[PDB]
Design an enzyme around this catalytic site. Structure first.
Site, PDB file in Angstrom:
ATOM      1  N   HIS A  37       0.851  -1.153   0.000  1.00  0.00           N
ATOM      2  CA  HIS A  37       0.000   0.000   0.000  1.00  0.00           C
ATOM      3  C   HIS A  37       0.894   1.211   0.000  1.00  0.00           C
ATOM      4  N   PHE A  92       0.282   4.183  -0.648  1.00  0.00           N
ATOM      5  CA  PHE A  92      -0.296   5.312   0.101  1.00  0.00           C
ATOM      6  C   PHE A  92      -0.559   4.954   1.585  1.00  0.00           C
ATOM      7  N   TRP A  93      -1.389   3.939   1.805  1.00  0.00           N
ATOM      8  CA  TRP A  93      -1.882   3.612   3.129  1.00  0.00           C
ATOM      9  C   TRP A  93      -0.810   3.251   4.108  1.00  0.00           C
ATOM     10  N   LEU A 138     -16.050  10.006  -1.730  1.00  0.00           N
ATOM     11  CA  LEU A 138     -14.785  10.005  -2.472  1.00  0.00           C
ATOM     12  C   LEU A 138     -15.073   9.420  -3.863  1.00  0.00           C
ATOM     13  N   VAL A 171     -13.401   9.373  -8.033  1.00  0.00           N
ATOM     14  CA  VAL A 171     -12.583   9.792  -9.142  1.00  0.00           C
ATOM     15  C   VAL A 171     -13.248   9.369 -10.505  1.00  0.00           C
ATOM     16  N   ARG A 197      -3.332   7.536  -9.201  1.00  0.00           N
ATOM     17  CA  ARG A 197      -2.915   8.005  -7.874  1.00  0.00           C
ATOM     18  C   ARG A 197      -3.546   9.367  -7.493  1.00  0.00           C
ATOM     19  N   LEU A 198      -4.683   9.708  -8.071  1.00  0.00           N
ATOM     20  CA  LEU A 198      -5.385  10.943  -7.725  1.00  0.00           C
ATOM     21  C   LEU A 198      -6.155  10.820  -6.382  1.00  0.00           C
ATOM     22  N   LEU A 222     -24.372   7.562   5.260  1.00  0.00           N
ATOM     23  CA  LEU A 222     -25.232   7.846   4.119  1.00  0.00           C
ATOM     24  C   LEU A 222     -24.571   7.465   2.758  1.00  0.00           C
TER      25      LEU A 222
HETATM   26  C1  LIG Z   1      -8.133  13.932  10.201  1.00  0.00           C
HETATM   27  C2  LIG Z   1      -8.829  13.904   8.869  1.00  0.00           C
HETATM   28  C3  LIG Z   1      -8.529  12.706   7.984  1.00  0.00           C
HETATM   29  C4  LIG Z   1      -9.578  12.530   6.901  1.00  0.00           C
HETATM   30  C5  LIG Z   1      -9.279  11.502   5.856  1.00  0.00           C
HETATM   31  C6  LIG Z   1      -9.563  10.110   6.330  1.00  0.00           C
HETATM   32  C7  LIG Z   1      -9.257   9.076   5.272  1.00  0.00           C
HETATM   33  C8  LIG Z   1     -10.271   9.029   4.155  1.00  0.00           C
HETATM   34  C9  LIG Z   1     -10.059   7.879   3.187  1.00  0.00           C
HETATM   35  C10 LIG Z   1     -11.112   7.812   2.110  1.00  0.00           C
HETATM   36  C11 LIG Z   1     -12.463   7.363   2.624  1.00  0.00           C
HETATM   37  C12 LIG Z   1     -13.440   7.217   1.489  1.00  0.00           C
HETATM   38  C13 LIG Z   1     -14.831   6.756   1.859  1.00  0.00           C
HETATM   39  C14 LIG Z   1     -15.668   6.443   0.636  1.00  0.00           C
HETATM   40  O1  LIG Z   1     -16.167   7.351   0.058  1.00  0.00           O
HETATM   41  S1  LIG Z   1     -15.871   4.888   0.116  1.00  0.00           S
HETATM   42  C15 LIG Z   1     -16.342   4.984  -1.568  1.00  0.00           C
HETATM   43  C16 LIG Z   1     -15.225   5.300  -2.558  1.00  0.00           C
HETATM   44  N1  LIG Z   1     -15.717   5.513  -3.900  1.00  0.00           N
HETATM   45  C17 LIG Z   1     -16.010   4.702  -4.865  1.00  0.00           C
HETATM   46  O2  LIG Z   1     -15.927   3.553  -4.755  1.00  0.00           O
HETATM   47  C18 LIG Z   1     -16.487   5.269  -6.160  1.00  0.00           C
HETATM   48  C19 LIG Z   1     -15.956   4.481  -7.344  1.00  0.00           C
HETATM   49  N2  LIG Z   1     -14.524   4.448  -7.316  1.00  0.00           N
HETATM   50  C20 LIG Z   1     -13.694   5.448  -7.429  1.00  0.00           C
HETATM   51  O3  LIG Z   1     -14.093   6.517  -7.627  1.00  0.00           O
HETATM   52  C21 LIG Z   1     -12.199   5.243  -7.371  1.00  0.00           C
HETATM   53  O4  LIG Z   1     -11.884   3.910  -7.720  1.00  0.00           O
HETATM   54  C22 LIG Z   1     -11.554   5.632  -6.022  1.00  0.00           C
HETATM   55  C23 LIG Z   1     -11.682   7.121  -5.731  1.00  0.00           C
HETATM   56  C24 LIG Z   1     -12.228   4.862  -4.901  1.00  0.00           C
HETATM   57  C25 LIG Z   1     -10.100   5.240  -5.994  1.00  0.00           C
HETATM   58  O5  LIG Z   1      -9.257   5.891  -6.908  1.00  0.00           O
HETATM   59  P1  LIG Z   1      -8.508   5.078  -8.006  1.00  0.00           P
HETATM   60  O6  LIG Z   1      -9.088   3.828  -8.173  1.00  0.00           O
HETATM   61  O7  LIG Z   1      -8.441   5.887  -9.156  1.00  0.00           O
HETATM   62  O8  LIG Z   1      -7.088   4.733  -7.431  1.00  0.00           O
HETATM   63  P2  LIG Z   1      -5.900   5.718  -7.225  1.00  0.00           P
HETATM   64  O9  LIG Z   1      -4.916   5.334  -8.180  1.00  0.00           O
HETATM   65  O10 LIG Z   1      -6.322   7.081  -7.290  1.00  0.00           O
HETATM   66  O11 LIG Z   1      -5.445   5.472  -5.787  1.00  0.00           O
HETATM   67  C26 LIG Z   1      -5.067   4.261  -5.212  1.00  0.00           C
HETATM   68  C27 LIG Z   1      -5.088   4.309  -3.709  1.00  0.00           C
HETATM   69  O12 LIG Z   1      -6.389   4.528  -3.194  1.00  0.00           O
HETATM   70  C28 LIG Z   1      -6.785   3.516  -2.346  1.00  0.00           C
HETATM   71  N3  LIG Z   1      -8.247   3.332  -2.333  1.00  0.00           N
HETATM   72  C29 LIG Z   1      -8.999   2.710  -3.168  1.00  0.00           C
HETATM   73  N4  LIG Z   1     -10.232   2.804  -2.794  1.00  0.00           N
HETATM   74  C30 LIG Z   1     -10.285   3.467  -1.674  1.00  0.00           C
HETATM   75  C31 LIG Z   1     -11.269   3.880  -0.793  1.00  0.00           C
HETATM   76  N5  LIG Z   1     -12.555   3.630  -0.937  1.00  0.00           N
HETATM   77  N6  LIG Z   1     -10.920   4.590   0.248  1.00  0.00           N
HETATM   78  C32 LIG Z   1      -9.682   4.874   0.469  1.00  0.00           C
HETATM   79  N7  LIG Z   1      -8.740   4.484  -0.334  1.00  0.00           N
HETATM   80  C33 LIG Z   1      -9.008   3.794  -1.405  1.00  0.00           C
HETATM   81  C34 LIG Z   1      -5.967   2.329  -2.786  1.00  0.00           C
HETATM   82  O13 LIG Z   1      -5.859   1.317  -1.823  1.00  0.00           O
HETATM   83  C35 LIG Z   1      -4.652   2.976  -3.201  1.00  0.00           C
HETATM   84  O14 LIG Z   1      -3.722   3.162  -2.178  1.00  0.00           O
HETATM   85  P3  LIG Z   1      -2.598   2.150  -1.858  1.00  0.00           P
HETATM   86  O15 LIG Z   1      -3.011   0.775  -1.387  1.00  0.00           O
HETATM   87  O16 LIG Z   1      -1.512   2.164  -2.897  1.00  0.00           O
HETATM   88  O17 LIG Z   1      -2.027   2.449  -0.489  1.00  0.00           O
HETATM   89  C1  LIG Z   2     -30.338  -5.488  -5.657  1.00  0.00           C
HETATM   90  C2  LIG Z   2     -30.745  -5.303  -4.221  1.00  0.00           C
HETATM   91  C3  LIG Z   2     -31.233  -6.647  -3.708  1.00  0.00           C
HETATM   92  C4  LIG Z   2     -29.646  -4.810  -3.327  1.00  0.00           C
HETATM   93  C5  LIG Z   2     -28.850  -3.639  -3.892  1.00  0.00           C
HETATM   94  C6  LIG Z   2     -29.623  -2.538  -4.284  1.00  0.00           C
HETATM   95  C7  LIG Z   2     -29.056  -1.403  -4.811  1.00  0.00           C
HETATM   96  C8  LIG Z   2     -27.672  -1.389  -4.916  1.00  0.00           C
HETATM   97  N1  LIG Z   2     -26.869  -0.386  -5.387  1.00  0.00           N
HETATM   98  N2  LIG Z   2     -25.553  -0.874  -5.261  1.00  0.00           N
HETATM   99  C9  LIG Z   2     -24.466   0.030  -5.705  1.00  0.00           C
HETATM  100  C10 LIG Z   2     -25.537  -2.107  -4.752  1.00  0.00           C
HETATM  101  C11 LIG Z   2     -26.870  -2.492  -4.495  1.00  0.00           C
HETATM  102  C12 LIG Z   2     -27.424  -3.690  -3.949  1.00  0.00           C
HETATM  103  N3  LIG Z   2     -26.756  -4.801  -3.276  1.00  0.00           N
HETATM  104  S1  LIG Z   2     -25.943  -4.886  -1.755  1.00  0.00           S
HETATM  105  O1  LIG Z   2     -25.422  -6.187  -1.380  1.00  0.00           O
HETATM  106  O2  LIG Z   2     -26.865  -4.567  -0.709  1.00  0.00           O
HETATM  107  C13 LIG Z   2     -24.712  -3.822  -1.829  1.00  0.00           C
HETATM  108  C14 LIG Z   2     -24.868  -2.548  -1.297  1.00  0.00           C
HETATM  109  C15 LIG Z   2     -23.852  -1.633  -1.411  1.00  0.00           C
HETATM  110  C16 LIG Z   2     -22.645  -1.945  -2.028  1.00  0.00           C
HETATM  111  C17 LIG Z   2     -21.565  -0.871  -2.143  1.00  0.00           C
HETATM  112  C18 LIG Z   2     -20.421  -0.906  -1.127  1.00  0.00           C
HETATM  113  C19 LIG Z   2     -20.680   0.154  -0.085  1.00  0.00           C
HETATM  114  C20 LIG Z   2     -20.174   1.531  -0.508  1.00  0.00           C
HETATM  115  C21 LIG Z   2     -20.167   2.478   0.673  1.00  0.00           C
HETATM  116  C22 LIG Z   2     -19.667   3.806   0.206  1.00  0.00           C
HETATM  117  C23 LIG Z   2     -19.653   4.844   1.330  1.00  0.00           C
HETATM  118  N4  LIG Z   2     -20.909   4.844   2.066  1.00  0.00           N
HETATM  119  C24 LIG Z   2     -21.043   5.862   3.084  1.00  0.00           C
HETATM  120  C25 LIG Z   2     -21.833   3.726   2.171  1.00  0.00           C
HETATM  121  C26 LIG Z   2     -21.587   2.620   1.157  1.00  0.00           C
HETATM  122  C27 LIG Z   2     -22.484  -3.214  -2.592  1.00  0.00           C
HETATM  123  C28 LIG Z   2     -23.521  -4.134  -2.491  1.00  0.00           C
END
Ligand SMILES: CCCCCCCCCCCCCC(=O)SCCNC(=O)CCNC(=O)[C@H](O)C(C)(C)COP(=O)(O)OP(=O)(O)OC[C@H]1O[C@@H](n2cnc3c(N)ncnc32)[C@H](O)[C@@H]1OP(=O)(O)O
Ligand SMILES: CC(C)Cc1ccc2nn(C)cc2c1NS(=O)(=O)c1ccc(CCCCC2CCN(C)CC2)cc1
Length: 411
Positions: free
Chosen positions: A2, A4-5, A159, A161, A169-170, A411
């Site tokens: 990781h 980053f992490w 979050l 991208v 790495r954004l 949420l």
């Molecule tokens: C004191 C205050 C502190 C506040 C901050 C607290 C921390 C907040 C942390 C965030 C809380 C978020 C809460 C939510 O919203 S969870 C939901 C996140 N969003 C999505 O899933 C939407 C669809 N996906 C995307 O948009 C992208 O694939 C994302 C943005 C997820 C990754 O971008 P991308 O795919 O283009 O990759 P990269 O090349 O830029 O970057 C790669 C790095 O990112 C790490 N990565 C992947 N997924 C996640 C993830 N969900 N949390 C944290 N890190 C994640 C990964 O292990 C790697 O690092 P490393 O293993 O090399 O180390």
């Molecule tokens: C088809 C239905 C029976 C269930 C269902 C409905 C709508 C969905 N929309 N999506 C996108 C996934 C869905 C899903 N199936 S699930 O197992 O309950 C699941 C629910 C959520 C996830 C997404 C992972 C959770 C993401 C985090 C992001 C940050 N956050 C604050 C909450 C959720 C996967 C499967």
């Protein structure tokens, strides 16, 4: 590995986390003065943008990005499609810090390429009770209880991208910039959840769903008559009969929550939430914001008897785009939010949630096995989905706990 992490103040392995006993910070203490006053450097093609959540146009831009680029399930059947009104509600709770909403835009066309959001939360995140009692009787009660006071921290959500820009790495840069902005407010911890495994969760739970409209769900997810229903021979009338619900609520005294319920809802919620190791603390303003009915977004009902609120439930709406599909573009899901039962069994309170959701045209009710959500699963006919929600802290050592010890709904 990781890249980053591994440079961040989080436990690094399930192992490190399984030998933690007391809650507390990971990093050396820092001051606001220590923290860079300028944003974190990015490509000169890009710029940092703080959207305005009172601008319908900024909300619109965040909306479109999440609609096309936010969370999908593992098989790419569904993507969240949070509405504009939902985003405003979620991003602007009482006392929110506009600075904490952090966007990356392309300098040229002002195109939104990435987003992360922080919002304030008052959270109890002290040593879990079980570990506190162990410590108490080794003479370490004071250590164990040192961080019992609810803390004003940040909660990170949304979050995202753009797909064109993934794996560049954004995401780490967005996270560093959010951290900087938060630290500049003198906040040192964050809570976040994710569908993916990262270093390192303190709790993890399965998702559970309940069909409300079995017809449509089946023409979606299968896309025909599922395993055992097209198996004994008569499906569809069998599926409908299996998931049918009353047309009207069963608890007389059930009505919509109204502004004057705020103080009683808050008190019965707080009493309940206080028995969990991790949970939020809400003022009246926060109860108002997160629980008063808000059209299309959040739906909240109280059981009132002899002019007193004895029970309530809430659910919020997140539709998901149905990805590979001509017929129906959207699955209308209701998500179980906060609740509290004092005069009836929980399965009986939540049955009315289902009836209400169903009568308002939701297709499905979803939830994670936090709070006392497991207690009604079988009785109300929920099944495990393929998702798992993992709960994480930033800069806070915390023991591994069951998701039934967690009371923060995200949420
Ligand atoms: C004191 C205050 C502190 C506040 C901050 C607290 C921390 C907040 C942390 C965030 C809380 C978020 C809460 C939510 O919203 S969870 C939901 C996140 N969003 C999505 O899933 C939407 C669809 N996906 C995307 O948009 C992208 O694939 C994302 C943005 C997820 C990754 O971008 P991308 O795919 O283009 O990759 P990269 O090349 O830029 O970057 C790669 C790095 O990112 C790490 N990565 C992947 N997924 C996640 C993830 N969900 N949390 C944290 N890190 C994640 C990964 O292990 C790697 O690092 P490393 O293993 O090399 O180390
Ligand atoms: C088809 C239905 C029976 C269930 C269902 C409905 C709508 C969905 N929309 N999506 C996108 C996934 C869905 C899903 N199936 S699930 O197992 O309950 C699941 C629910 C959520 C996830 C997404 C992972 C959770 C993401 C985090 C992001 C940050 N956050 C604050 C909450 C959720 C996967 C499967």
């Amino acid at each position: 590995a990781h890249a980053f992490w591994s440079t961040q103040p989080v436990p690094q392995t399930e192992d490190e986390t399984e030998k933690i006993v007391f809650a507390g910070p990971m990093d050396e203490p820092k001051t606001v003065a220590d923290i860079p006053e300028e944003p974190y450097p990015i490509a000169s093609t890009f710029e940092w943008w703080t959207p305005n959540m009172e601008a319908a146009d900024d909300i619109h831009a965040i909306y479109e990005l999440l609609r096309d680029n936010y969370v999908e399930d593992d098989d790419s059947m569904f993507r969240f499609n949070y509405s504009e009104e939902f985003l405003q509600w979620a991003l602007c709770p009482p006392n929110y810090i506009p600075d904490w909403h952090v966007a990356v835009r392309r300098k040229a066309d002002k195109k939104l390429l990435a987003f992360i959001a922080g919002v304030p939360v008052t959270l109890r995140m002290g040593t879990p009770k079980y570990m506190k009692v162990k410590a108490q009787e080794k003479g370490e009660g004071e250590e164990a209880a040192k961080y019992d006071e609810p803390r004003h921290i940040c909660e990170i959500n949304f979050l995202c991208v753009h797909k064109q820009l993934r794996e560049k790495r954004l995401a780490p840069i967005l996270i560093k910039e959010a951290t900087r902005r938060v630290n500049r407010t003198n906040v040192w911890q964050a809570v976040y959840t994710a569908g993916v495994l990262l270093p390192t969760p303190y709790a993890s739970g399965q998702y559970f769903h309940r069909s409300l409209n079995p017809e449509k769900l089946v023409e979606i997810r299968f896309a025909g008559a599922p395993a055992q229903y097209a198996a004994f021979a008569n499906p569809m009338a069998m599926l409908k009969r299996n998931y049918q619900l009353p047309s009207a609520p069963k608890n007389s005294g059930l009505r919509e929550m109204k502004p004057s319920d705020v103080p009683q809802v808050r008190r019965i919620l707080m009493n309940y939430l206080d028995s969990f190791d991790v949970g939020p603390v809400f003022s009246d303003a926060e109860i108002s914001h997160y629980l008063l009915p808000r059209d299309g977004v959040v739906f909240t009902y109280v059981v009132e008897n002899d002019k007193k609120v004895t029970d309530f439930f809430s659910f919020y709406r997140i539709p998901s785009t149905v990805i590979g599909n001509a017929n129906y573009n959207l699955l209308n899901a209701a998500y179980v939010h906060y609740y509290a039962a004092t005069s009836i069994p929980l399965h009986q309170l939540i049955l009315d949630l289902l009836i209400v959701a169903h009568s308002r045209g939701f297709d499905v009710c979803n939830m994670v096995e936090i709070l006392d959500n497991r207690s009604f699963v079988e009785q109300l006919k929920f099944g495990a989905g393929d998702g798992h929600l993992r709960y994480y802290f930033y800069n806070w050592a915390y023991p591994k706990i069951k998701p039934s010890q967690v009371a923060l709904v995200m949420l």
